[PDB]
Structure formats: structure tokens, C-alpha cells
């Protein structure tokens, strides 16, 4: 045939792949962690958004740290040969490098290690997307007025907030980041490459949201998400 180009991931396998959504709202009392009002809005929005992208969505609620690790291990041991990609969304409390099960923390590196190129062979060479709505620390942004492949290749981490910073969640509307992510996927997934969709998410969160609080420490604060890409190709959710 004619000249060919190979700059984009193959997304025309029989299945787009799994979308695992872990939605942790209620935490064991002994942890002292607050309930995450608004997270069900996020989980429902994500389920619908990724359904319309033709992902096989699995929603899981209020998982312990042990259940999170066993779920991720089990999913990584499925046969993904007929799937184009893998998506995991984590909605919980967090700190830098950590997301919380209902009874204690899980290392993000432990979760993602299950999907390394050498440990999940049916996802080798395929994009592995981790979308994380969770705090990464306690800083607040005051704003300003205006052949082999690496085992860590083909991962993308879409973080809601900058490293070291809190992440913001509205109890009525859902989190700033997930609200914005679903809106941009709905509008642009048939149009734009995924990095460019996520850049529009960055702009939406950075420009349209600002916290309101009776507590001066927490009032009038801003947020910028962080795209962490080890992808090796362009990612389009559509194919020709």
C-alpha cells in the first residue's frame, strides 16, 4: 500500500478498554478523615463520560486499602489483548504519592506498578491512564490578578492539582478538576488529541474556579492541574 505514519496509538482494537473508577466517599471513623461530599457527582459524571467514549466502566465505592490493592492486582492480571487502553480514576483523600483507602493509605507507585510494561504484558505498548482527584499536600495557591521499551513507558497521570497542594472539591457540583475533565472530554474527544484536551482542562480549572470560604486561610484560592506524561504516541479517542 501507500506511505504510512505511526505517530498515534492504535485505538481500533475491538474494545477501548476498562475504565475503573474508585470512589471513596466515607472513611473509617478511626482514620479521622472527613466524608467527601460531592464525590458521587464526580463518579456519575465520569461513568457517563467514559461510557460515551465506549469504555467498559466499573464503578467501585468505599474500598479499603486492601481492596484497592487487590482490585488493581486482579485487573492487571486480566487478558487485555483485545483492549486498546486502560483507564483508572481515583477519587479520594490523598497526599503526595498517596491515595487513601477507607482505612488507610495506598502508595500510588504500588497501584501503577501492576501495569508496568513487564508486569501486564497485554497492555505493553498501550496507553495506561491514571486520573487522580486527591490532595497532594496542604499548600494553597493564592493566585495572581491578571528491541525493548522502558517498563515505565506509556503511562499518563492526570493529576487534579500541583504537587504539594490541596485539591478542591465542591460539595454540590463535584470537584473542580473532574467537572472540567468531563466537560472537555464531552466537547473535544471527537476532535482533539488527549494532551490538548487536558491542556483545556488546565485552563478551565485555572481560570473559572476560585474558592469561597468564611475562613481567611482557605478563601480566594486557585488550582492548576498537572499533566504527567510518559506517553510515546499521540492519543485520540476516535479512529478513522
Amino acid at each position: 500500500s501507500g506511505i504510512s505514519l505511526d505517530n498515534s496509538y492504535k485505538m481500533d482494537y475491538p474494545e477501548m478498554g476498562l475504565c475503573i473508577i474508585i470512589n471513596n466517599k466515607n472513611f473509617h471513623k478511626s482514620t479521622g478523615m472527613t466524608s467527601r461530599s460531592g464525590t458521587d457527582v464526580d463518579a456519575a459524571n465520569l461513568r457517563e463520560t467514559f461510557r460515551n467514549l465506549k469504555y467498559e466502566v466499573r464503578n467501585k465505592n468505599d474500598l479499603t486499602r486492601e481492596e484497592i490493592v487487590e482490585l488493581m492486582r486482579d485487573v492487571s492480571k486480566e487478558d487485555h489483548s483485545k483492549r486498546s487502553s486502560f483507564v483508572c480514576v481515583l477519587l479520594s483523600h490523598g497526599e503526595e504519592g498517596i491515595i487513601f483507602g477507607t482505612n488507610g493509605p495506598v502508595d500510588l507507585k504500588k497501584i501503577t506498578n501492576f501495569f508496568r510494561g513487564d508486569r501486564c504484558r497485554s497492555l505493553t505498548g498501550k496507553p495506561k491512564l491514571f486520573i487522580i482527584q486527591a490532595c497532594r499536600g496542604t499548600e494553597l495557591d493564592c493566585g495572581i490578578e491578571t528491541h525493548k521499551i522502558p517498563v515505565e513507558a506509556d503511562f499518563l497521570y492526570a493529576y487534579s492539582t500541583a504537587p504539594g497542594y490541596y485539591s478542591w472539591r465542591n460539595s454540590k457540583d463535584g470537584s473542580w478538576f473532574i467537572q472540567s475533565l468531563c466537560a472537555m472530554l464531552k466537547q473535544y474527544a471527537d476532535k482533539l488529541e488527549f494532551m490538548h484536551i487536558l491542556t483545556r482542562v488546565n485552563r478551565k480549572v485555572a481560570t473559572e474556579f476560585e474558592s469561597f470560604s468564611f475562613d481567611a486561610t482557605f478563601h480566594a484560592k486557585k488550582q492548576i492541574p498537572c499533566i504527567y506524561s510518559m506517553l510515546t504516541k499521540e492519543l485520540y479517542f476516535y479512529h478513522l
Binding site: 461530599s37 479520594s92 483523600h93 490523598g94 478542591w168 472539591r169 460539595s171
Partner: peptide, 4 residues
């Protein structure tokens, strides 16, 4: 607005 709440923090995670």
C-alpha cells in the same frame, strides 16, 4: 468548597 472543600479540600480533599
Amino acid at each position: 468548597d472543600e479540600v480533599d
